[PDB]
Amino acid sequence: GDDRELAILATAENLLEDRPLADISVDDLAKGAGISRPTFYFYFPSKEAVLLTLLDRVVNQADMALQTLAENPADTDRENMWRTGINVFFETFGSHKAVTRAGQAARATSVEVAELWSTFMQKWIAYTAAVIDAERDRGAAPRTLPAHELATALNLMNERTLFASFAGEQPSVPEARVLDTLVHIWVTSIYGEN
Amino acid sequence: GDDRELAILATAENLLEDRPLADISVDDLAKGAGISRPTFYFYFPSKEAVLLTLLDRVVNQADMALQTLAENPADTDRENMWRTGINVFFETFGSHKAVTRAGQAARATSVEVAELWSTFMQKWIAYTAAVIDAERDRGAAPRTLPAHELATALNLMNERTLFASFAGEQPSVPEARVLDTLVHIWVTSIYGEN
Ligand SMILES: CC(C)(C)OC(=O)N1CCC(c2nc(-c3cccs3)no2)CC1
Ligand SMILES: CC(C)(C)OC(=O)N1CCC(c2nc(-c3cccs3)no2)CC1
Secondary structure, eight states: OHHHHHHHHHHHHHTTTTOOOOOOHHHHHHHHTOHHHHHHHHHHHHHHHHHHHHHHHHHHHHHHHHHHHHOOOOOOOOHHHHHHHHHHHHHHHHHHHHHHHHHHHHHGTTHHHHHHHHHHHHHHHHHHHHHHHHHHHTTTTOSSSSSSHHHHHHHHHHHHHHHHTTOOOOOOHHHHHHHHHHHHHHHHHHHOOO | OHHHHHHHHHHHHHHHHHHHHOOHHHHHHHHHHHHOHHHHHHOOHHHHHOOOOOOOOHHHHHHHHHHHHHOOOOOOOOOHHHHHHHHHHHHHHHTTTTHHHHHHHGTTTOOHHHHHHHHHHHHHHHHHHHHHHHHHHSSSOOSOOOOHHHHHHHHHHHHHHHHHHHHHHHOOOOHHHHHHHHHHHHHHHHOOOO
């Protein structure tokens, strides 16, 4: 009943390693999962619904992980604080590169995928702006740009930059350099007077 | 002979305002251009080839404009220097939002579009890193991150952020705030010790 769904999901992720969604069929997924094609159709209406679910799981896993840090006041400098937070996304999405690649491409063809991404991007930006605001309150960061606007561009940077790196796009920041790169830009733009 | 091509190009850009490429037909474009369908096929092999050409023109227009500034040593502060350069892209792409939207989406389905974008992104990053290097040489900017890595992430920020704004994505930085936002992050990350 339920392993069947989980077997579909694993097969989908497995097969996403080697080819896009357009090159994987319901037969491909039923076959991998040890089920017939109409039995697939009991768990999912389409291969696109399988992707949506994979992406949902990865996005939520990154969100929950971020909330774990949000509840814990880890004794450290400002720089370490942002690094560990950026690291949540580096590690989560980086541990699921195929789903991330596929999920990003699916934004353009699927309003459910587009909505999903939009929802969590809104949450992550709001939390970032909440933290920049706290920093400003305590006199740790200067009152420069509107915090929500600053938080938007920085999170958009992280999206584009982390994902370009994972896919090895030309141009991209090498995966082994991306964390350091993003953290530099975050700290100097949040804390910098100029 | 040649206005016919230019009429196809104008009709394509006109029609891109109201719907995507998938909702515009060769008949749509021949019709707008005052030509028959087989006469279209003399100038372009596909609607996708019409897009590629539109994008090529917009990318080159932004590149030439950037090179005009690159040759001129405009007397001003560091902040103004980057602002006018970022402005080249804000203005060019912002004056051609439909082609930009369509051209960005076409990256995913067209290796010629993907290659085109990749080529110019490589050029623009190289020039940015060349300027950061000059700044460092003259003692204007500190030797923090590798310049080419810094330049990559900043240009990726500009890509994602400017384009999200133009399309009015949720989340996005309002178009009237995006220039100020990007310039802040560029100046603090290039010039900031921390
Ligand atoms: C200070 C704490 C740990 C609370 O927050 C952070 O350090 N953050 C908040 C969220 C930031 C974030 N990055 C991202 C994305 C990366 C890639 C695509 S979205 N989404 O949110 C990373 C830094
Ligand atoms: C200092 C000079 C004027 C030489 O350069 C700049 O100010 N630049 C270099 C190029 C930078 C750039 N932005 C972009 C993109 C914006 C949107 C998509 S690419 N490409 O290159 C903008 C700032």
